[PDB]
Motif scaffolding. Structure first.
Motif, PDB file in Angstrom:
ATOM      1  N   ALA A 162     -10.419  72.163  92.119  1.00  0.00           N
ATOM      2  CA  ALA A 162     -11.147  70.968  91.717  1.00  0.00           C
ATOM      3  C   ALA A 162     -10.748  69.820  92.630  1.00  0.00           C
ATOM      4  CB  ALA A 162     -10.877  70.606  90.252  1.00  0.00           C
ATOM      5  N   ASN A 164     -11.276  65.371  93.359  1.00  0.00           N
ATOM      6  CA  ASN A 164     -11.616  64.048  92.834  1.00  0.00           C
ATOM      7  C   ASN A 164     -11.523  64.007  91.309  1.00  0.00           C
ATOM      8  OD1 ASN A 164     -12.523  62.868  95.536  1.00  0.00           O
ATOM      9  ND2 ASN A 164     -13.952  64.585  95.311  1.00  0.00           N
ATOM     10  N   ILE A 165     -10.484  64.633  90.768  1.00  0.00           N
ATOM     11  CA  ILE A 165     -10.203  64.594  89.338  1.00  0.00           C
ATOM     12  C   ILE A 165      -9.377  63.351  89.043  1.00  0.00           C
ATOM     13  CG2 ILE A 165      -9.286  65.883  87.376  1.00  0.00           C
ATOM     14  CD1 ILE A 165     -11.637  67.213  88.745  1.00  0.00           C
ATOM     15  N   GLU A 166      -9.668  62.697  87.922  1.00  0.00           N
ATOM     16  CA  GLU A 166      -9.012  61.454  87.544  1.00  0.00           C
ATOM     17  C   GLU A 166      -8.174  61.653  86.288  1.00  0.00           C
ATOM     18  OE1 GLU A 166     -11.502  58.032  87.322  1.00  0.00           O
ATOM     19  OE2 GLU A 166     -12.412  58.344  89.295  1.00  0.00           O
ATOM     20  N   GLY A 167      -7.028  60.984  86.245  1.00  0.00           N
ATOM     21  CA  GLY A 167      -6.147  61.049  85.102  1.00  0.00           C
ATOM     22  C   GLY A 167      -5.174  59.890  85.109  1.00  0.00           C
ATOM     23  N   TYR A 190      -4.809  64.391  82.247  1.00  0.00           N
ATOM     24  CA  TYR A 190      -6.237  64.224  82.464  1.00  0.00           C
ATOM     25  C   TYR A 190      -7.007  65.050  81.444  1.00  0.00           C
ATOM     26  CZ  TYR A 190      -6.218  68.821  84.722  1.00  0.00           C
ATOM     27  OH  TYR A 190      -6.084  70.166  84.987  1.00  0.00           O
ATOM     28  N   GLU A 191      -8.210  64.586  81.116  1.00  0.00           N
ATOM     29  CA  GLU A 191      -9.081  65.240  80.139  1.00  0.00           C
ATOM     30  C   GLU A 191     -10.324  65.732  80.875  1.00  0.00           C
ATOM     31  N   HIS A 192     -10.163  66.824  81.614  1.00  0.00           N
ATOM     32  CA  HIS A 192     -11.248  67.354  82.430  1.00  0.00           C
ATOM     33  C   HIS A 192     -11.793  68.656  81.855  1.00  0.00           C
ATOM     34  N   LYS A 194      -7.479  68.055  76.778  1.00  0.00           N
ATOM     35  CA  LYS A 194      -6.535  67.274  77.564  1.00  0.00           C
ATOM     36  C   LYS A 194      -5.475  68.191  78.162  1.00  0.00           C
ATOM     37  CE  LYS A 194      -4.836  63.599  75.586  1.00  0.00           C
ATOM     38  NZ  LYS A 194      -4.158  62.285  75.401  1.00  0.00           N
ATOM     39  N   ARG A 215      -6.492  59.410  91.235  1.00  0.00           N
ATOM     40  CA  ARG A 215      -7.433  60.450  91.621  1.00  0.00           C
ATOM     41  C   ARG A 215      -6.697  61.474  92.470  1.00  0.00           C
ATOM     42  NH1 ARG A 215     -10.545  57.573  94.364  1.00  0.00           N
ATOM     43  NH2 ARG A 215     -12.165  57.152  92.794  1.00  0.00           N
TER      44      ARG A 215
END
Ligand code: EMC
Ligand code: EMC
Length: 238
Positions: A162, A164-167, A190-192, A194, A215
């Motif tokens: 993955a 550009n995941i944000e947390g 992060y909650e992609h 949780k 990010r």
């Protein structure tokens, strides 16, 4: 002496490494008849481990003095692994000693011992960083058997899962000297659903503070059975 046709058959009885020709190979002759033929230690192209049901190549040798036909120059066929059911793993040759070496495994943390006799291809050399496929056996002593060479760019020790995941940084990495930490690290939440993910100071330019939005890219480290956050950077536009 030895016939010229490349015969194809299956191992009916393996050799006992733990009758001068105790092994047995069942093949189909050119006249569609089923034939069993014995073989011994020197009849294998290498001292690798053959198993019951393995598809093998061989040549038929006729010994008039011994009054029997023999399978010789036996080599394991790659199609066996497509029907074997054995667990095939990947890795690279990490070190080479005299008679043995160690492999850097994809799915295992420790270096894996391997005998030089388990290399299936006796026609080519083995070198450091050779991408290989093998089967792991246990005896608390682990070793790789039935080692096959892999084409280039076949082995990946980590995969991008993955981007550009944000947390949020929920535990800041320890404020670190010259050597880069690879054990303690920090924690990003992060909650992609949780989830938590570890990050290290080596994988960010300018360290993020506790509670800051970040990010990052996620890479799967297979030998550790975990994912790691890399390319960590702060997020100003929330
Ligand atoms: C244990 Hg490789
Ligand atoms: C969006 C604040 Hg960690």
């Amino acid at each position: 002496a030895v016939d010229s046709t490349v015969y194809k058959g299956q191992v009916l009885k393996s050799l006992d490494r733990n009758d001068p020709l105790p092994g047995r190979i069942r093949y189909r002759a050119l006249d569609y008849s089923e034939v069993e033929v014995p073989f011994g230690d020197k009849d294998q192209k290498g001292d690798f481990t053959l198993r019951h049901g393995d598809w093998v190549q061989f040549l038929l040798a006729t010994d008039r003095r011994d009054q029997l036909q023999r399978a010789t120059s036996i080599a394991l066929l790659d199609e066996t692994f497509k029907v074997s059911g054995e667990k095939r793993e990947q890795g690279t040759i990490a070190s080479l000693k005299e008679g043995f070496g160690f492999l850097r495994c994809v799915e295992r943390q420790a270096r894996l011992f391997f005998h030089f006799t388990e290399v299936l291809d006796t026609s080519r050399e083995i070198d450091i960083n050779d991408e290989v496929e093998f089967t792991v056996i246990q005896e608390s002593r682990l070793q790789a058997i039935r080692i096959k060479h892999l084409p280039p760019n076949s082995v990946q020790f980590e995969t991008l899962v993955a981007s550009n995941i944000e947390g949020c940084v929920t535990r800041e990495a320890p404020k670190s000297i010259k050597s880069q930490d690879r054990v303690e690290g920090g924690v990003i939440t992060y909650e992609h659903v949780k989830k938590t993910i570890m990050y290290f100071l080596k994988d960010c330019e300018k360290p993020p503070r506790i509670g800051e939005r970040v990010r990052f890219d996620i890479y799967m480290v297979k030998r550790n059975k975990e994912c790691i956050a890399v390319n960590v950077q702060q997020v100003s536009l929330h």
